[PDB]
From a paper:
Type IV pili (T4P) are functionally versatile filaments widespread in prokaryotes, composed of type IV pilins and assembled by conserved multiprotein machineries. We show that PilB is a modular pilin with a bulky module “grafted” onto a small pilin module, which directly mediates adhesion of S. sanguinis to host cells/proteins. PilB, one of the three minor pilins in S. sanguinis T4P, exhibits a canonical N-terminal class III signal peptide, the defining feature of type IV pilins. The larger size of PilB is due to the presence of a C-terminal domain readily detectable by bioinformatics, which belongs to the von Willebrand factor A–like domain superfamily (InterPro entry IPR036465).
To confirm that metal binding involves the MIDAS motif, we produced PilBD319A in which the key MIDAS residue Asp319 was changed into an Ala by site-directed mutagenesis. Binding assays performed with PilBD319A showed that changing this single residue abolishes the metal-binding ability of PilB for both Mg2+ and Mn2+. Next, to determine whether metal presence/absence might impact the 3D structure of PilB, we solved the structure of PilBD319A by X-ray crystallography. The PilBD319A protein readily crystallized in the same condition as the wild-type (WT) protein. We collected a complete dataset on crystals diffracting to a resolution of 3 Å and solved the structure of PilBD319A by molecular replacement. The structure of PilBD319A clearly shows that no metal is occupying the mutated MIDAS pocket on top of the central β-sheet, which is consistent with metal-binding assays. Although PilBD319A resolution is significantly lower than WT, it nevertheless allows for meaningful structural comparison. When the vWA modules were compared, we found that they are essentially identical, the Cα atoms superposing onto each other with an RMSD of merely 0.45 Å, including the two arms flanking the MIDAS pocket. This shows that metal binding by MIDAS has no detectable structural impact on PilB.
Numbering used by the authors: 43 to 461
The structure:
């Protein structure tokens, strides 16, 4: 009657579900983060593992008093010297609950035809569940906590927004006043304020505002922590005087300003949210590029000024001079377009070292005004950081992407904080 050992492993899994249901956060670990005993065990995170030897399902708890783990035997009995194997997986989710699938199996010393409890399914009462297993692992241990992480590293966020003429029109590109619609800038103000409000919910996060047009401008150069009142930023955002559309689209300068402001801050989690609503058509060059017939001035003739051998302005000193500007008001010159994108590429390559991710949002109803958002995002990707491009064609879509960006920020915080 082998039903005894099978029922034993089932009782053990019942104990596991009982303990997991009470957890606020879950993390599936592997051979790296759990090789049995307290080896490599991370502070303040209780576990549930297969026991370094391999036959007693172990449960390590956090004493928090003696600052140590309290080894305990899962359930209360002990099997009859059987070879165990445990494996956890994230099997999707029910309505708003997430499902886990414990899989306990075992064989017996120097024999075959193992025995097992096929695969269970347990729904957790939380949503903060992640997996820290990789490429060829299984997930053999479980990490959790009862009370939330009692405060962790801070986050820095730079909002590089477009403030060009292409932002005064509709989303759908029609006229400003000829239609009863709100300009891209107005809707950006609304959605950005909503983002700011729901962003402070992360806690320990500070955001600054950078605006780019023909050149870049610091709307709020000081990184104000939302924990001390979000109203400090919202005001500057809704301030009717500043932040109005004017000029060509120069993303390189905006990236430079945002990345430098992020490099300054001490938060070990830096992010840049860039919003553009037009094809890139401008860039800034170094004073050196102002040599012989290197600057072709078709400004009054064909409406543009280009540089044959552009030496992009990548100096930490932020300044603007019309004489060092390359642009194409009609955004029809492929040379100026490619150079405007390469400018942001070099800027990201130099000022984007400790940046976690760069979110590029193309906010435009015109199907072609944001045709290079993906290209610009990929170019910025050369800096060696995570880059995500997204297109928002309506107010609802813009709010959806802003909310999703906040969600991803919280997931990176929870993941980085608490393994």
């Amino acid at each position: 009657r082998e039903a005894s050992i099978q029922a034993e492993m089932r009782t053990s899994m019942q104990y596991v579900d009982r303990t997991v249901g009470k957890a606020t956060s879950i993390f599936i670990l592997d051979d790296s983060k759990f090789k049995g005993s307290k080896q490599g065990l991370t502070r303040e995170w209780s576990y549930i593992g297969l026991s370094a030897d391999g036959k007693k399902v172990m449960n390590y708890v956090w004493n928090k008093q003696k600052q140590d783990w309290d080894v305990s035997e899962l359930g209360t009995k002990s099997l009859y010297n059987m070879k165990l194997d445990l494996e956890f997986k994230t099997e999707g989710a029910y309505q708003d609950n997430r499902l886990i699938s414990y899989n306990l199996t075992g064989k017996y010393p120097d024999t075959n035809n193992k025995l097992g409890i096929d695969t269970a399914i347990s729904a957790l009462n939380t949503k903060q569940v992640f997996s820290k297993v990789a490429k060829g692992k299984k997930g053999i241990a479980i990490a959790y906590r009862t009370d939330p992480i009692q405060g962790q590293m801070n986050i820095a966020v730079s909002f590089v927004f477009d403030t060009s003429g292409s932002m005064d029109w509709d989303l759908q590109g029609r006229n400003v006043k000829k239609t009863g619609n709100e300009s891209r800038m107005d809707i950006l103000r609304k959605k950005s304020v909503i983002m700011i409000k729901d962003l402070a919910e992360i806690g320990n996060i500070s955001v600054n505002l950078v605006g780019f047009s023909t050149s870049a401008k610091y709307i709020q150069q000081n990184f104000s922590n939302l924990d001390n009142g979000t109203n400090t930023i919202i005001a500057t955002i809704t301030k009717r005087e500043n932040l109005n559309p004017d000029g060509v689209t120069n993303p390189g300068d905006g990236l430079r300003y945002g990345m430098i402001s992020l490099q300054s801050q001490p938060a070990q989690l830096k992010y840049i949210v860039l919003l553009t609503a037009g094809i890139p058509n401008a860039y800034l060059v170094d004073s050196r590029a102002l040599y012989a017939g290197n600057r072709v001035d078709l400004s009054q003739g064909a409406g543009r000024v280009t540089f044959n051998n552009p030496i992009y302005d990548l100096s930490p000193t932020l300044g603007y001079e019309y004489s060092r500007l390359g642009y194409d008001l009609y955004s029809r010159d492929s040379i100026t377009r490619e150079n405007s994108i390469a400018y942001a590429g070099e800027v990201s390559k130099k000022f984007g070292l400790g940046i976690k991710r760069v979110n590029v949002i193309g906010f435009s109803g015109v199907n072609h005004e944001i045709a290079y958002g993906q290209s610009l995002t990929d170019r910025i990707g050369e800096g060696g950081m995570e880059t995500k491009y997204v297109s928002a064609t309506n107010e609802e879509a813009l709010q959806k992407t802003f909310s999703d960006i906040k969600k991803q920020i919280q997931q990176d915080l929870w993941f980085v904080s608490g393994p």
